[PDB]
Design a protein around this ligand. Structure first.
Ligand code: NI
Length: 341
């Protein structure tokens, strides 16, 4: 049965609620972004209206084969009427096509559903500036003060410098980057740009990237692996056994691998600076874990919420344990007492 935090009161609407069958009373199913925990349940046999971004709609049609007649893409930053209710989609600074949704209820209540997001001060000058929000449905993935990580720009700088140094020392080195979902495309695109290479990948991953409206994409990616010195592989294959096997496959064109695993947070974040990160090495293979996040840090989350000053907060992540729920409620109250709302 559909949990309460996926339902929007006073409407016929649900958010990211596709794995519960026909939800009673739901006239429109919103999808915030194309990540499997959120779309779980959608397939080519779905026959209710799906509201989403243009990019999410490209992926539903091409990857899941949802039929066109049930896909309703909306432009961002634009007041739209859906089944009699004003809505706006905002960029969530998550993966390509990810949105936050503002609902303007007929009784006067305003609700923000962040989907998954990485809060940024630029959101303080979006259409959120213009009116009060009563209820916030919040991505609380990293709602604890131990969760620190650097900016995306610092992480990309480390990756570009690491890759460029290694390949300039050894022109026969190969760079490999792990992936298991959309998101974090800047990692492999920035590295290939500094190396003067296209990124090589499987036909299935190429297909996915071609749905993303990335400018000049045909100039940046390819299915011809052997012409490329940046390869993408499934995240599961980024280990010594998997990479040894991959090195065989190139016909001794390459004699060293430098591989990147963009994780979210790992506890090495509490002691080590990005500058000081070191790989795991075996022989001619080195693996870097780099903390590239597409969710808010604790400080970025706190700043957003203290700026927005919502009347009520509904977490959408870490809701399964009493200890989690109590921890999150404590921080929400600190924040409200410190700022005075
Ligand atoms: Ni996500």
């Amino acid at each position: 049965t559909c949990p309460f935090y996926k339902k929007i009161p006073g409407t016929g609407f649900t958010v990211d609620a596709f794995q519960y069958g026909v939800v009673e009373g739901c006239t429109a199913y919103f999808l915030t972004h194309f990540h499997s925990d959120h779309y779980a349940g959608l397939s080519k046999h779905f026959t209710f209206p799906v509201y989403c971004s243009e990019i999410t709609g490209n992926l539903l049609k091409n990857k899941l084969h949802v039929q066109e007649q049930y896909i309703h893409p909306l432009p961002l930053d634009t007041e739209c009427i859906v089944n009699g209710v004003k809505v706006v989609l905002l960029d969530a600074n998550h993966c390509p096509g990810a949105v936050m949704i503002l609902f303007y209820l007929p009784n006067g209540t305003v609700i923000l559903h962040t989907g998954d997001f990485r809060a940024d001060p630029s959101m303080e000058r979006s259409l959120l500036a213009d009116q009060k929000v009563h209820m916030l449905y919040l991505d609380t993935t990293y709602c604890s003060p131990e969760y620190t990580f650097p900016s995306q720009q610092e992480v990309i700088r480390f990756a570009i410098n690491t890759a460029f140094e290694a390949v300039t020392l050894n022109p026969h080195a190969l760079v490999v980057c792990g992936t298991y979902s959309i998101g974090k495309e800047k990692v492999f695109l920035a590295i290939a740009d500094v190396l003067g290479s296209k990124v090589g990948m499987s036909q299935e991953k190429y297909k996915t990237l071609q749905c993303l409206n990335i400018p000049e994409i045909n100039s940046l990616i390819t299915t011809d692996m052997c012409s490329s010195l940046v390869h993408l592989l499934p995240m599961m294959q980024i280990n010594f056994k998997g990479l040894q096997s991959h090195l065989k496959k190139c016909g001794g064109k390459y004699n060293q691998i430098l591989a990147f695993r963009p994780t979210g947070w790992t506890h090495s974040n509490k002691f080590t600076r990005i500058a000081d990160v070191i790989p795991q090495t075996k022989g001619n293979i080195s693996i870097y874990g780099i903390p590239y996040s597409e969710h808010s840090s604790y400080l970025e989350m706190k700043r957003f919420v203290q700026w927005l000053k919502p009347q009520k907060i509904i977490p959408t992540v870490n809701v399964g344990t009493w200890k989690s729920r109590s921890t999150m409620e404590k921080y929400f109250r600190e924040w409200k007492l410190e700022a005075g709302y």
